[PDB]
Amino acid sequence: MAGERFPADFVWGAATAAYQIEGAVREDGRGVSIWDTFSHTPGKIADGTTGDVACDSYHRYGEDIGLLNALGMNAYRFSIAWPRIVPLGAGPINQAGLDHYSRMVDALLGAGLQPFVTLYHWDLPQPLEDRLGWGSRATATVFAEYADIVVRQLGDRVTHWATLNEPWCSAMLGYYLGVHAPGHTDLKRGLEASHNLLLGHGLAVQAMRAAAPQPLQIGIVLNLTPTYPASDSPEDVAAARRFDGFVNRWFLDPLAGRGYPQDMLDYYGAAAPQANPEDLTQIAAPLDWLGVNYYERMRAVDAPDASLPQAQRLDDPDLPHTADREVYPEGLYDILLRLHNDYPFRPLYITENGCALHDEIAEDGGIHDGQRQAFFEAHLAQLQRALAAGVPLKGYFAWSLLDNFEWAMGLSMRYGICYTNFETLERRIKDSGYWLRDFIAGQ
Ligand SMILES: OC[C@H]1O[C@@H](O)[C@H](O)[C@@H](O)[C@@H]1O
Ligand SMILES: OC[C@H]1O[C@@H](O)[C@H](O)[C@@H](O)[C@@H]1O
Ligand SMILES: OC[C@H]1O[C@@H](O)[C@H](O)[C@@H](O)[C@@H]1O
Ligand SMILES: OC[C@H]1O[C@H](O)[C@H](O)[C@@H](O)[C@@H]1O
Ligand code: NA
């Protein structure tokens, strides 16, 4: 395994999110989230499905633990559902929710699985959305409150915490492009949501450190899409830069204490939120790690007629595609080298990486997902290149542990290393899962 070995203390996991797996949407005091409302809105989800049952992991998380162990993982990245903890968003605690996750943490730790807890993976309580949701500063305050409550109960056992998952998605897909909950379609509302998300992050970090019974390792998780111009023309380079600012720098820079990127501010003009010095200070609260969710690159062509940021993807039919994305492993090297050299966050974790395929159970009973195996091998090779470059990477989480409710695509789009039969709830490990098992064991 020359050149293939990762650090002996490397974190090896798989990842999930509460609304995608849990089900039990009305049980044990759970409130209504924006994704309950959105999934039950006609035509918002591709295939008529909802998260009402999903993988039934509310009841079945011991099965999930069994899979993690069968895989020889040493960690599990999962989210806590705010609707189970503070059903009204701003309001009383629901102790049955806290006690469920407490039991789940003890089960994980008992099994030798470090919990990597995401506080916010998109399931905003609907009552908050009724009051503008991420469009309101008050939501930031009450998000920090929620962070406080959870860390008070679980922070004697869970050291590693992420405040938000992918605030670009929450803001832009949820408030600008309308493809995620709550489903609004206004640029200024998306940018305002981005700010309040960032603010909430920063407020929560401070709240968590105060509320914690021991020192924590607190991070945030960002989707990053390395962007490349399709030519070196001024037009295509500028288009690459705008897309890069839209997705990456818009979040990285304020987190890094650099304020919002001025190119973007000027570009958005009227639509840009008002960002006082005080909020930017709070947004840059010191972090102990950064999580990177990596799936794809953007090869950008100028598109003056399109919506902001006026940049279209140029498809490359020479690169392989999965069920829903282009495969470009080298982009993971590039993005990590950029973070290592250009930004201050360290250590880094790959909090998600994975792919969707048209997975089926074969005649023999296995799932022969060689493309997903190759996806992991190629990305893990790039991570070995990045580590050889000095990048302080401390773990890797495959998205996902098991096939699940894939947001607007529903149960139809399978990302698991384990196959989920949605009718019987049986899980079965796919070939890529066995590969990860044996790679991790070998070391
Ligand atoms: O119409 C939106 C959704 O409403 C839900 O109550 C149904 O269970 C789904 O099958 C349907 O897609
Ligand atoms: O005890 C109420 C609930 O608590 C959860 O933690 C368990 O996973 C469920 O099976 C049970 O219904
Ligand atoms: O689309 C695959 C995955 O992409 C990421 O943006 C999200 O964090 C996951 O919840 C989603 O399932
Ligand atoms: O048939 C294999 C798979 O094909 C496609 O991805 C379908 O969307 C999915 O529902 C099915 O499980
Ligand atoms: Na393909």
> Alpha carbon of 366 to those of 130, 332, 369, 424, 432: distances in Å?
46, 29, 9, 17, 11
Nearest ligand to the CA atom of 416:
3
Asked if 239 and 263 count as a contact pair (C-beta separation under 8 A), the reply is no
Instruction: Name the residue type at position 368.
Output: H
Residues facing 162 on adjacent strands: 118, 219
**Alpha-carbon 381 to chain mean position:** 22
Burial of 416 (0-12, 13-18, 19+ CB in 10 A): buried
Non-local (6+) Cβ contacts of 273 within 8 A are 188, 191, 192, 194, 195
Active site residue 377: no
- Intra-chain end-to-end CA distance of the chain, in Å: 8
- Name the CA radius of gyration of the chain, rounded: 21
| Residue nearest (by alpha carbon) to ligand 3 atom 12 | 406
Ligand 4 environment, Cβ below 6 A: 323, 358-360, 412, 414
Alpha carbons 269 and 220: distance in angstroms, whole number: 27
Active site residue 166: yes
Q: How far is the CA of 17 from the centre of ligand 4 (A)?
A: 21
Alpha carbons 349 and 164: distance in angstroms, whole number: 14
Q: Out of 32, 35, 38, 39, give the residue to mutate to test ligand 1, the one with the largest number of ligand atoms within 8 Å of its CB.
A: 39
Q: Which atom of ligand 3 is least distant from the CA of 406?
A: 12
Can you give the resolution of this entry in Å? 1.6
Q: Out of 50, 52, 405, 422, give the residue to mutate to test ligand 1, the one with the largest number of ligand atoms within 8 Å of its CB.
A: 50
Asked if 25 and 87 count as a contact pair (C-beta separation under 8 A), the reply is no
Cis peptide before 42 (omega within 30 of 0): no
For the chain, how many helices (H) and strands (E)?
Answer: 16, 13
> Alpha carbon of 405 to those of 46, 62, 127, 169, 182: distances in Å?
11, 19, 23, 16, 16
Asked if 213 and 156 count as a contact pair (C-beta separation under 8 A), the reply is yes
Q: How far is the CA of 382 from the centre of ligand 1 (A)?
A: 41
Instruction: Name the residue type at position 94.
Output: N
Alpha carbons 254 and 415: distance in angstroms, whole number: 31
Burial of 110 (0-12, 13-18, 19+ CB in 10 A): exposed
Q: How far is the CA of 321 from the centre of ligand 5 (A)?
A: 4
Task: Write a three-state SS string for 1-27.
Answer: CCCCCCCCCCEEEEECCHHHHCCCCCC
Domains of the chain: 1-443 (3.20.20.80)
CB 358 less than 6 A from any atom of ligand 2: no
Ramachandran region, residue 45 (left: φ > 0; alpha: ψ -120 to 50; beta: rest): beta
